[PDB]
Each structure stands twice: as C-alpha cells, then as structure tokens.
Amino acid sequence: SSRVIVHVDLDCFYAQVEMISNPELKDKPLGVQQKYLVVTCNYEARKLGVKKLMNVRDAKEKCPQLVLVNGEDLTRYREMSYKVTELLEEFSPVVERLGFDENFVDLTEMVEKRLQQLQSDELSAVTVSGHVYNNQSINLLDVLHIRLLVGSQIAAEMREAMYNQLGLTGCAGVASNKLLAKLVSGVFKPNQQTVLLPESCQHLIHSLNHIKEIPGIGYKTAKCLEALGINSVRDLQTFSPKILEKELGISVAQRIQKLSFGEDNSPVILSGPPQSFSEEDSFKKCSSEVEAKNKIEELLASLLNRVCQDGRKPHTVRLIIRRYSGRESRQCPIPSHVIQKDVMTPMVDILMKLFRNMVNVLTLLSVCFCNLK
DNA sequence: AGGACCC
DNA sequence: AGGGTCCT
Ligand SMILES: [Cl-]
C-alpha cells in the first residue's frame, strides 16, 4: 500500500519571522544571532557568503553591512511554528513536526478522496504543480504518478495558504515516504516544490555525496560507518548486512541500510501538543554557584508563564548542566500541591537540591518541564 | 540518566 | 545556539 507524503520546509524560518516583525530588514542582508553564532540568515545574506551556524566575526568579516537581530528568545518562532502546523492540520490531521520549521503530512487518504471525485475525462487533465525531480516524464496512465501529481497540487495549496494566511514561504517535497519527501523538498530552493516519481528514487539517493546526508544517520553513526570504509550511499547499499549488524546493532543496521536504498516504512506520527517545555542559557563559566540560583530563577520565571498558557501542567521537572571543558541531568516528580498554577520558592528549592546533587559547592543551565497531563 | 537523532 | 523527539 503506497503512500503520498509531503514534507514542508520553511525557508530561513527565524529570519522570515524577524523580517515580518520589522519590514525595514526585508531588503537588507539579515542574520539571526544567538550568543556568538549566526544561527540563520535570509537569502540576501546567503548571496554575500553568510552561512548557517557561522560565527558572528566570520560573518561580519564576510558581510560588514550584515544586520544582526537577537534570536535567543524563541517565543515568537515557537508561536509561528505552531500556526504553520495547525494550518497544515486543517488539510489533513496527521501532521508530524520535525523541529520548529519542518512538517510531514500524510496525504494518502486526501489524495484518494480527490481521485474518487474526478471524472474519466477529468483524469487525463491532471497536471503537476511545481518541479518534477530530474525532469522525469509523467505517465498519466500510471496510478502512482497520478497520485503523486495530486499530492503536488495539495502541496501547492498548502504553500499558498501558508503565504496568504501567515505570510511565510517554504519549500515542499512530495514522495512515497518520509525519507524521500524530505530529500526531494530541498532540491529547488527557496520557496519552491518538487515531486519525486518512483523511477527517479535511485537518482535522488545517489545524488547524495556523504552518508551523513541521509536523515537518520547522525554524527556518531557516520563516524562509525566511515571507520568501516563506508562513505558513499552505494557503499552502504552494498556493505555486508551481517557485519553492519554486529558493529551497529541490528536495529540501527537494518534501518539505515534500508534508508540507503530509499526505503522508509516509518509512519507519519501526529505530533499534537508538545511533550516538554524547557529553557536554557549558555555562558562562559558560572562557578559562582550562588548565581546559578539567579540563572535558574530567571529560567524558571519565564517557563512558568509558558506553562500557564498551555493549560496542561508538567508532572516532572529536570535540571540539566554542562561541564566546563557531555551534559548531566537530575529530575524528580513535581509535588502535587506545587502543580496548582507563589510556586517559585518551592520550585527553586527543588531545583537547587537537584543542582547540589549534581555539583559540589558550568557552561550551561537548562530547566525542563515534562511528563505533561 | 544517558545517548541517538532532528531543526 | 536553543530548542525538540524517542530509545536503552
Ligand atoms: Cl522496517
């Protein structure tokens, strides 16, 4: 049973939000700064050589006119992110969030509903919206092609609604599973879409230049694969299954070897409301382990406002720390009476105990509310 | 708790 | 960087 999946990928998301907030930035090169880092930038800045996650000095020495806005407070980005997800959920309810700026939508049922409504002569006029990957020829008699073209039409409706209703541009990719939809959505950027017909799957997967470019193959797995002489997609396709299992475990080995062929049976999961709320701060050294209570009190204060708005409350609190020159965490249940929401002073007490439990009286402090109900 | 992955 | 997910 084949599926029609769309991957929606917002262009330079934080920059888009900031440009909407201050139109004066719309025509100037823009970078969103967090600490010493340019986490993202609009395309005007990318023209001038600015890259994501490029340190501010390197970025200013490449674009001295680069306008910098602070993006350490994620509140506005998070709000717009959920407006996108909710808009897509109106199309079809099964929407999976991947970070703040990507969504997967399973269009299968929607596509079949639209096809049922078409007349015979109507079927021969089905047209693609946007790009066809690798300029592949469409066969209107192929039912897989028809379904994917209808997927491309729904994807264009989504992108038009996002722009008309929210002012945001993004790319979309339409394919038969999540892996392929996500790989194909970035083929034409920015603000464009691409559909992958099945015959071009091997062309898409072999277009990658490192196995680390496969979604799901992270730093540790890549480093491990490279240690085995596996570098290209075809290397992973042809590597011995038995050895790969022994080195990576059978779960990781079998899944990522399927990914190397473009195979991905994973379902689109309805993300729904978030599973956790957290806030953090990075810094160079906080060994005044009495200022930590101040940092933790500030983080806790802002978090408390967010928990009130969601309406659901956390049943677990967690404190994370990073050690000077990799993280450690302590969690514990939140006492039931404390959940009625002055909750600061008890929360600080709980958190400090977790703190003291971990540190003997730091480059990061993070507080998380989780286990929601 | 810790580790893998994602943006 | 400042967030998130699920698995062991
Ligand atoms: Cl499987």
Amino acid symbol at A36: Y
Spatial contact of A217 and A225, defined as CB atoms under 8 Å apart: yes
Which method, experimentally, gave rise to this model? Answer: X-ray
Q: How far is residue A162 from each of residues A76, A151, A153, measured CA to CA in Å?
A: 17, 16, 14
Binding residues of A for Mn(2+): 9-10, 101
Report d(CA A355, CA A74) in Å as an integer: 25
- Pairing between β-strand A5-10 and β-strand A314-322 as defined by DSSP bridges: unpaired
Domain annotation for chain A: domains and CATH numbers: 1-11+74-196 (3.30.70.270), 12-73 (3.40.1170.60), 197-273 (1.10.150.20), 274-373 (3.30.1490.100)
Q: How far is residue A244 from each of residues A120, A202, A208, A229, A265, measured CA to CA in Å?
A: 50, 22, 20, 11, 20
Task: Give me ligand 1 centre to Cα A84, in Å.
Answer: 30
Protein residues placing their CB within 5 Å of the ion ligand 1: A 265
Give the count of beta carbons closer than 10 Å to the beta carbon of residue A195. 31
Binding residues of A for Mg(2+): 9-10, 101
Report d(CA A319, CA A321) in Å as an integer: 7
A34 touches strand B (CB under 7 A): no
Looking at residue A311, the DSSP 8-state letter turns out to be: -
Q: Supply angle C-alpha A370, A272, A157, rounded to 5.
A: 145
User: What is the CA A318 to C1' B1 distance in angstroms?
Assistant: 11
Q: Supply angle C-alpha A129, A133, A134, rounded to 5.
A: 135
Chain B bases closer than 7 A to any CB of the protein: 1-7
A261-298 exposure pattern, b = at least 16 Cβ within 10 A, e = fewer: ebebeeebeebeebeebebeebeeebeeeeebbebbbe
